[PDB]
Amino acid sequence: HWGYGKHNGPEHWHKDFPIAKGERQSPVDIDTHTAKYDPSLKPLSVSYDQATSLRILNNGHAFNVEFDDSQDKAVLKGGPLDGTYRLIQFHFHWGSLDGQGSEHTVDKKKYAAELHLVHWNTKYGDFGKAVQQPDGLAVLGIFLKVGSAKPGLQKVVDVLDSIKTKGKSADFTNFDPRGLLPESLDYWTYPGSLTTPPLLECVTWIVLKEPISVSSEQVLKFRKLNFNGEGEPEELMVDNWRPAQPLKNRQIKASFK
Numbered sequence: 001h002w003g004y005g006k007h008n009g010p011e012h013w014h015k016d017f018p019i020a021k022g023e024r025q026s027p028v029d030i031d032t033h034t035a036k037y038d039p040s041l042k043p044l045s046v047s048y049d050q051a052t053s054l055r056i057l058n059n060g061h062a063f064n065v066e067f068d069d070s071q072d073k074a075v076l077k078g079g080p081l082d083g084t085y086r087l088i089q090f091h092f093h094w095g096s097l098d099g100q101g102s103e104h105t106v107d108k109k110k111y112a113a114e115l116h117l118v119h120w121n122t123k124y125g126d127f128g129k130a131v132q133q134p135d136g137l138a139v140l141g142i143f144l145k146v147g148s149a150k151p152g153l154q155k156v157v158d159v160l161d162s163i164k165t166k167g168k169s170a171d172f173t174n175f176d177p178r179g180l181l182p183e184s185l186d187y188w189t190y191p192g193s194l195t196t197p198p199l200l201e202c203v204t205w206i207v208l209k210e211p212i213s214v215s216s217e218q219v220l221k222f223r224k225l226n227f228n229g230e231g232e233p234e235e236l237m238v239d240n241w242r243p244a245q246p247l248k249n250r251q252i253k254a255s256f257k
């Protein structure tokens, strides 16, 4: 039932998922001036050398690229984190227009899209158990602006027409997610939630300061996907983002300046 329209969009979610109005919801606006510099935050460790992508799927809300997370192959550690988080999937949120699309904002600025690389804490043994814990997930968020092409995104853009509608999937092997990373790993971090239902409050958010650039043609291809299944009337998969939620009693910490 939930989705991103007038009748089932983010403002309706609280009726099925009351945690929507909870104490640590995401995304948030990142006010760069009042984010607190913390010189004890460690550099983020992104070890994606042994990553094994498996498959790409249209789940009716976004497309996921899923990875084999049955061993420590692509992990996030360090930064604000304790222990090892294993990469399970990444996906994006994007707009109908280049002027919106991101879930987090920076001094109220929206970006054209936002990448989420979702990782789960290996001390909970799998993703389903991790989401039930306040430190179960670490999500690395990367903003996309429109400008030059991101060559490491093209393999993703080129498969999308094979997963146009809800429920479609395709083999997606040997995709290297290091090709989606900007040069700097400077980040903001705060405790928050999944930004889609069930909206569980289980996420340490790690949001990179530096956006990657993708071309207008790359982001246009995301907008040709469909929220509907093959049987049904075409509804373009656009504006699949949740707006900024109240920061409430939280401080966003910065790894820099």
Ligand SMILES: NS(=O)(=O)c1c(F)c(F)c(S(=O)(=O)CCO)c(NCc2ccccc2)c1F
Residues within 6 Å of the ligand: 059, 061, 064, 088, 089, 116, 117, 118, 127, 137, 139, 193, 194, 195, 196
């Ligand atoms: N926007 S978010 O980064 O906060 C986020 C997650 F953190 C996340 F873990 C997931 S996941 O739990 O479903 C990964 C499971 O393999 C999704 N969304 C994925 C999804 C898939 C099907 C239906 C709904 C959501 C997701 F959207």
Ligand SMILES: [Zn+2]
Residues within 6 Å of the ligand: 091, 092, 093, 116, 195
């Ligand atoms: Zn997301």
